[PDB]
Design a protein around this ligand. Structure first.
Ligand SMILES: Nc1ncnc2c1ncn2[C@@H]1O[C@H](COP(=O)(O)OP(=O)(O)O)[C@@H](O)[C@H]1O
Ligand SMILES: Nc1ncnc2c1ncn2[C@@H]1O[C@H](COP(=O)(O)OP(=O)(O)O)[C@@H](O)[C@H]1O
Ligand SMILES: Nc1ncnc2c1ncn2[C@@H]1O[C@H](COP(=O)(O)OP(=O)(O)O)[C@@H](O)[C@H]1O
Ligand SMILES: [Mg+2]
Ligand SMILES: [Mg+2]
Ligand SMILES: [Mg+2]
Lengths: 374, 374, 374
């Protein structure tokens, strides 16, 4: 075949988004979880299967304890990650990685060890001709088809912010904020408890993740919505648990995402996301700011909440000079923006020379990741 | 021969159900009773036979006092148990236990001593190559051919409840309730006495056991049926005693099994069986409950009463979320479910390595029962 | 009189600890139990007394079914709670609550409804000039006379963990773990059953509570002590039941409290208490940790077991940086720490303005609990 295709994998914590480069959507997207049988089984002709990976784990949740191998964009446990990748290639895609160059995503400002060790695995686990490790934000910017913008990247892992102008990139200006979907989830299960509902275990932690993925939304003004919580009508929603129990969540709903804008709720000093965006833009040269204000791109799973764009717009506009208009461009399909970006990058002809080649690695070692790529 | 066959014995109190592993029904099933001649005989060329075991005792009831060696899943008297096993092997099956591995059932949450001492006997009474001691509920779940369910196991011994999901098993969730066929019998002979019929002795205690095994049934609503007892037509039934006396039992019929649902009748606080099932399910992880509500399996002799399934369905449905449908799967042939399960387990190839070997016992002692098996 | 005194009540589940503020020990401490006559009485000139409350119930146990009105720091049944309070004021203290401000304790992360409804009662049941509802852990910290520490609060209700620095308090860092004395009791009665002793009913459930309150102790290494259970000498203890029966409990003794450190025994994923302490401390700012490691305060009834402090010390030290010394301060008289703390708080002059006044409640409603107090 010509070009051999190429493989693309986005692993921020939470989800693996994988598929062939050269396609508009990934084939396989499943949770990055390694569940292990915590309870000793007593039958015969079970499994045994030491552990389960991917949406298999979601299916068989109750038995397993689930461990997310990636936290804050850092891989805690490598064998687990390897297992997840194994599952992606063999269980879903059904590819021999020897037959494809593979692109990995990775978060900014992230420890060297992850990049280096990541590459070490790809070469000395799944024998592969070539690979590349790329910054998440840039990829989403490509996916949006814009050359310039400040990409607000918040996955389940961590939140990141990379201003870009006319390609280029500003290292000093790049900002990385420790908040995530996962931290919102931890907050949310906390806030439920004041209602009586107690979710103590990893299994049901994912149930609240599911709740947040739909029920929660961001206030266009927090205090107003909280005021109107007095007369509860629309702000309460019934949710059905798999157990059959019913949950009813009022104001607690929208204050969950509020945390992004008020990390004091979580107890961290680190400024809210909008202020971090200012922190990034303000670090940039005076000249370019005009378009960064106007070209803010949101990406990642934890920007999905309804109404986030609007709130960011209102806050940024409030803070900034009203001399210039602040457009925020947040597409739907943002969740997959990183992966799409990866697809487009591996599809690019010129890119086909920038790969880290197996050969190059074998001569020069794992450390070469930083040398060559950003 | 290949595989040597294998032997299976279910001893919850009341009945020994024994036969070859690898068959759909046991060969021998007889009451676990050791009758002793209480009255001194005066002839010559009698017996003497110090005692009788098995349905022999049933045949010659009047003379004997019967002693059930097992109470509440605990063996009161070991020599008696040994005698019963003796009878099973030599009198019915006609096997040398040296030539067969033997599987025993045993109830959950049961004293260690019973398992340990059980094994001690099997090795140092009937010399046997290998043996295993297995939980009653699991076996019935196998017999039902389902991988998941909450098995309500009530024999004559005691009642037990073990939720199982996808194999696995939840120790904390396992529930054991002190009610049984035998307690119903004791209640029943009490309740007859208000009608005039007085059954004071072990002999006729078994007569009432027999009555209960047919005449009694469970109300689909207790109070309604008791109300309709005013106009007695169908609720009375004539029963014939072996004496030739006739008994006529009305409302007293169905309130006997009612006890399972209202142990206040018996004077115990311990919740009714349906509530115990909820106690089990509620102990389990939120995720799996959906299928446990739907997969409740009834086993054991004292689930045989007509209408039990329906009542359990109505009560559980009433208590639970009506968001999810509560199927109860109670097969006919449930009585033998444990033994069938044993047959299927010993038939399994892989199981053939999990046996407790004679050798292993000889090195490691009797205590190894818990170490190896559940 | 000057200052009017003030009243203090600690209701975690299990025990009501009440007395006058301004004294070093409470006057009345009795079990929070509402026993009801389950068996219909037949004499004349009984009672009748629909139910019994407090150590009255302990005295007349056999007849009654006992219901603990508080579970997991949540009041299940309000009328019952009201009855208990009734008993405290009128039966023991002999006070008119109109003549005293009353302080109530309450657990962290606890449902709003409990605080709100609690206040609703205090104003509109026992007419009272003022009241306050206060977090359990803080009170114990006061009682210990330290300004800073991480208070490990485990009562019979639930276990809680609140780090405090120089006063202040860290909401995100506060942890609440569902284990308790009551869960240990449930575990314990389970574990006895393997020895033959079967305790099926609420009455004798309290007998095992009593056993645990003395016989049980925590291993300084679990596996070592369990190993030494082979040669049983000191690890067995005779206990006398009220029935006159004698119980003899070996290794089963110390594995009961082991559960706090290995909740897998109970079947919960939720980490052990020491790990929860780390979970709390790790959530806190890097700066303060040094003193939190050194200032851990244990409170509540279910820290009473001999050897808990030592085990916590060994585990925390093992997990933490050995760069800094980990003192754990666990006073004897810890059981009453919450109540003492309450005494000291109501004794404080400045506190006398922070009360929730009857007047304020009447204008503003019950919801004001959260508005004013923590
Ligand atoms: N539909 C949704 N609405 C709101 N939040 C969502 C939704 N889907 C996912 N999330 C949140 O975003 C997270 C997924 O982020 P993801 O894009 O997988 O990050 P990454 O690409 O870095 O792995 C989830 O864990 C969840 O908290
Ligand atoms: N046909 C029947 N109808 C109703 N109840 C029955 C019937 N047969 C047996 N029982 C009750 O169930 C008991 C038998 O239980 P069994 O299955 O032998 O328990 P286990 O398997 O634990 O020994 C009897 O003692 C009797 O009380
Ligand atoms: N002397 C003791 N030794 C060991 N455990 C005890 C002792 N006394 C009480 N306990 C355990 O602690 C519980 C009492 O906790 P308590 O302090 O009343 O909690 P709270 O203050 O939240 O009500 C009892 O139910 C028992 O399990
Ligand atoms: Mg991402
Ligand atoms: Mg049985
Ligand atoms: Mg307490």
């Amino acid at each position: 075949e010509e070009e051999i295709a190429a493989l693309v994998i986005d692993n921020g914590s939470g989800m693996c988004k994988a598929g062939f480069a050269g396609d508009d959507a990934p084939r396989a997207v499943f949770p990055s979880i390694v569940g292990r049988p915590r309870h000793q089984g007593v039958m015969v002709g079970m499994g045994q299967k030491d552990s389960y990976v991917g949406d298999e784990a979601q299916s068989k949740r109750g038995i397993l304890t689930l461990k997310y191998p990636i936290e804050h964009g850092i891989v805690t446990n490598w064998d687990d990650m390897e297992k997840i990748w194994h599952h992606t290639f063999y269980n879903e895609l059904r590819v021999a990685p020897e037959e494809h160059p593979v692109l990995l995503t990775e978060a900014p400002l992230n420890p060297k060890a992850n990049r280096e060790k990541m590459t070490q695995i790809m070469f000395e686990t799944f024998n592969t001709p070539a690979m590349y490790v790329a910054i998440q934000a840039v990829l989403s910017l490509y996916a949006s088809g814009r050359t310039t913008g400040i990409v607000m990247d918040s996955g389940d892992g961590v939140t990141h912010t990379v201003p870009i102008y006319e390609g280029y990139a500003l290292p000093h200006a790049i900002l990385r904020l420790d908040l995530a979907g996962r931290d919102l989830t931890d907050y949310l299960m906390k806030i439920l408890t004041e209602r009586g509902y107690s979710f103590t275990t990893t299994a049901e932690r994912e149930i609240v993740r599911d709740i947040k993925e739909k029920l929660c939304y961001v206030a266009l003004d927090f205090e107003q919505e909280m005021a109107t919580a007095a007369s509860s009508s629309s702000l309460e929603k019934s949710y059905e648990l798999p157990d059959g129990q019913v949950i009813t969540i009022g104001n607690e709903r929208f204050r969950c995402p509020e945390a992004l804008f008020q990390p004091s709720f979580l107890g961290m000093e680190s400024c809210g996301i909008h202020e971090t965006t200012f922190n990034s833009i303000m670090k940039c040269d005076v000249d370019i700011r005009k378009d960064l204000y106007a070209n803010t791109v949101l990406s990642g799973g934890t920007t999905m909440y309804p109404g986030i764009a609007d709130r960011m717009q209102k806050e940024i506009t409030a803070l900034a000079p009203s001399t210039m208009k602040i457009k925020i461009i947040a597409p739907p399909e943002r969740k997959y923006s990183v992966w799409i970006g990866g697809s487009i990058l591996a599809s690019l002809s010129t890119f086909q020379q920038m790969w880290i080649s197996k050969q190059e690695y074998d001569e020069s070692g794992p450390s070469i990741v930083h040398r060559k790529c950003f």
